[PDB]
Nucleic acid binder design. Structure first.
Lengths: 92, 124, 131, 119
RNA sequence: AUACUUACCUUAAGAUAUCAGAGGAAAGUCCUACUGAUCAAACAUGCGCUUCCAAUAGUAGAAGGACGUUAAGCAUUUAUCAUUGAACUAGUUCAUUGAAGUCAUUGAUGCAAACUCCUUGGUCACACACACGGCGCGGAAGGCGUGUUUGCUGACGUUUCCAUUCCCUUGUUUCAAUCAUUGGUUAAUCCCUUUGGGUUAAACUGAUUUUUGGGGCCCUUUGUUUCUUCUGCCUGGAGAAGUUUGACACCAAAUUCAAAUUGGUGUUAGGGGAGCUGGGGCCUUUCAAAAGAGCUUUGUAGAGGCAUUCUUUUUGACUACUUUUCGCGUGCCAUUUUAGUUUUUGACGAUUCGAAUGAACUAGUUUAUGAUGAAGUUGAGAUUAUUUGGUCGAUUGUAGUUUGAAGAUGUAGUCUCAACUUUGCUCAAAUUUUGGAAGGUCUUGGUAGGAACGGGUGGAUCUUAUAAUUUUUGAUUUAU
């Protein structure tokens, strides 16, 4: 699906997270899988009650993610082209 | 206000500003762009609105004015697990005819790309 | 019985147009709410302080001017010296108003209560205005 | 057998979709997805009042109800009326379908016969 | 772009509307640009369908915002835990040791207003018009209906494939002058057969075009009309070239050393008219089907009815009469020197004219005067009342009809109804609906790609793995 492909297109850019536990992890996205579980680098953390800390590396489970904020300039990214023309696939 | 087509599914509606309800009682309002099998969708310019615990007593049964604390977060990707129901707020910046026009021009340009690529690959 | 000019023509629904018109006259009136609107039959009040009914046609002759009727003539005038020739403005425009040359039709139902012949005469002279 | 294929023949009927929140939705029904995603048209969706001398209702459902934009300010009780609500499938608890329709005609699945007629 | 080296890796499955009937290769399957019904999509096209689309006769207003100010606004509530010692009431202050400790207190929560600023709209046309609640041109968003095509949709390849256009304009609008072109009307003259036709020049009128002048609105078009490029502009609105296997603009690089090179993004537009073509409504003509404009007798066809009896039993059933017990009719045909009500205003308020008075304007004109004049009786029908004419519940027994049981004895014609034809008497033509063909008119859409065929093709949708921790077969209605 497109929503996950946009998350793969956001690698290496600052993103925000909301876990369903209520916390907020904002920082740079290193890895993401098709299970939506991502790992982030040099991230600032906001606990559900507002206490903010800083951690260098984090890995979160995709099932616990609520929304992900992605740099706005990915809006016009080619994933959202409705009528697009692909070439023929290679024969293997 | 706004009348949605009597039969319109989530695929028919794109670029409409929507209003999304999650399990936690907060709302994400913005333009829908994509969605998926399990219904996690992508909003363009979206603002999460929240009724504070202090304003909530005002909604219990007895003109009400609720102070809804909201914060702006652009180009998000929601999760289908959290989504509860979806409502339509507005209709897109472009009319239906204009969207047909841009769709046709976009398709023609797309074909021109395939020809310009094919004949740039073939001779060299 | 009162007569207006240069009102907004654009709202096409009489119950919405009386919503707008009534809204400009009396903010915080009975109806800013919009569950329902009252409809007195020919032969109850719309709003407090004198208002009773509102009349608008779509005809090209009557286009911009819509007429208001009141409970009694002294309150009908009392609305006129409420503003005292200080022009109120509806949606975009200041209105110029005056006393209606023809008496209020629903006011005739109150007067004679204090009317089949009029309904016959209206069908007849209407039949002739068709000619 | 997938009994959801029954709901797809209930199209254009008055129905109440009673959700997990306790929120109830009266409306005219449109196409139901295979995941039981239910899309309605003209809906009045509300919350019941537990009486019990003021027992606080669902706190999340009131917020989610005011945040649809369809709750009108002058409603005394807790309701909202709107057009076109789309409901995710896993949110549904009960569905109350009208009394008029007959089940014996609608509960026959064409795949169930098709499997037996072919063998 | 080519060659070599090294690394990383390879096909979830199936399907493309359903139902029913007929046919081809007893059961099942497959198939039929086969037949019907239903469903879906696209495209057209309609509805007195619904809602909405901002002031210029003015310095406004509607919707939505500020992650804006006033603003330390006003009113409230908050600022860590543990150990040891000193004092202290019988919890409080100070000092030391340890643990964690979002920032804020000009905060946070509640309450309300004023101001300022942003985005958006047909800021369209006609109209300033005494009504009983329309039927101006468009745009946006819906609902409902008919029709066509198709049965998920699109790229790619192949073909005796089929295709195959132009012109003007890029401020706009209006008026005037003059020029040119076409059409109609009138007068005069000539010719041919009082009338008709043709030609001539002249006059008037409508439509279109060229040059100038005047006026109106717009120029934010901000890179001065944004379809490019080049020239160029406010005392002006211009000129040249060009328009999709192409051109242009722009971004990126590393070198060379200002061009190009390679890789990428975007633009190629709007308006009108002619042609051609699709759809809709209306009119006229032609055609096909269907229907409508008494009685008697005879003939034909169809349908129905017409051939066991007698006796007993059934508080078996139904109807009628009489008896016992606990004048009326919610009843009806004819007639009132009968009555009352309604109906037909059946018959015997509006408009116009004349006269008088009042008011206004310059004898005349207009307005007003429930302001004057002129253009109850009879008959019929229905209902109600009165009068005389007049007519008509339960137990037992008898009679009639039907059903059941038992016993005994024996072993083609007529009538009615419907349809068609013919004859007597009386008082092929035309009309309408449905469907097809042609022509005219109005209106709307399209105008360069389309058809067929083919696949180790893309994407959408559906079925199954798939109700077992990562989304849709439940741990957020805060619960005991």
């Amino acid at each position: 699906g497109i929503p996950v492909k946009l998350l793969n297109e956001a690698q290496g850019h600052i993103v925000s997270l909301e876990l369903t536990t209520g916390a907020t992890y904002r920082g740079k996205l290193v890895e993401s899988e098709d299970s939506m579980n991502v790992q982030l680098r040099d991230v600032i953390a906001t606990e559900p009650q507002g206490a903010v800390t800083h951690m260098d590396q984090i890995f979160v489970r995709g099932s616990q993610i609520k929304f992900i904020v992605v740099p706005d300039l990915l809006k016009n990214a080619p994933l959202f082209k409705k009528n697009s023309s692909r070439p023929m696939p290679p024969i293997r | 206000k706004i009348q949605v087509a009597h039969s319109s599914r989530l695929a028919n509606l794109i670029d409409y500003k929507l209003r999304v309800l999650t399990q936690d009682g907060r709302v994400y309002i913005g333009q829908l762009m994509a969605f998926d099998k399990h219904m996690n969708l992508v909003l363009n310019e979206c603002i999460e609105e929240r009724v504070p615990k202090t304003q909530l007593d005002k909604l219990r049964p007895r003109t009400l004015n609720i102070k809804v604390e909201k914060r702006v977060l652009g180009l998000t990707i929601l999760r289908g697990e959290q989504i509860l129901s979806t409502v339509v707020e507005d209709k897109p910046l472009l009319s239906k005819k204009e969207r047909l026009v841009r769709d046709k021009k976009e398709k023609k340009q797309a074909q021109k790309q395939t020809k310009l690529r094919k004949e740039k690959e073939k001779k060299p | 019985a009162l007569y207006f000019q240069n009102l907004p023509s654009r709202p096409a629904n009489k119950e919405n147009y009386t919503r707008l018109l009534l809204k400009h006259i009396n903010p915080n009136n009975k109806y800013a709410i919009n569950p329902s609107l009252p409809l007195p039959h020919n032969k109850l009040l719309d709003d407090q302080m004198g208002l009773l009914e509102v009349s608008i046609s779509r005809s090209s002759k009557m286009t911009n001017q819509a007429f208001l009727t009141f409970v009694t003539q002294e309150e009908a005038d009392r609305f006129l010296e409420k503003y005292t020739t200080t022009a109120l403005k509806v949606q975009g425009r200041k209105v110029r108003m005056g006393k209606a040359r023809t008496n209020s039709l629903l006011g005739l139902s109150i007067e004679m209560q204090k009317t089949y012949n009029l309904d016959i005469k209206k069908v007849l002279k209407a039949r002739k205005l068709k000619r | 057998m997938k009994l959801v294929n029954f709901l797809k023949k209930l199209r254009n009927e008055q129905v109440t979709i009673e959700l997990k929140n306790g929120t109830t939705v009266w409306g005219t029904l449109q196409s139901v997805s295979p995941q039981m995603n239910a899309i309605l048209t003209d809906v009045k969706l509300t919350l019941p009042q537990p009486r019990l001398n003021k027992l606080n209702s669902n706190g999340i459902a009131m917020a989610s109800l005011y945040l649809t934009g369809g709750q009108q300010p002058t409603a005394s009780d807790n309701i909202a009326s709107l057009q076109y609500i789309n409901i995710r499938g896993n949110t549904i608890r009960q569905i109350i379908l009208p009394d008029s329709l007959n089940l014996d005609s609608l509960l026959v699945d064409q795949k169930q016969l098709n499997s037996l007629r072919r063998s």
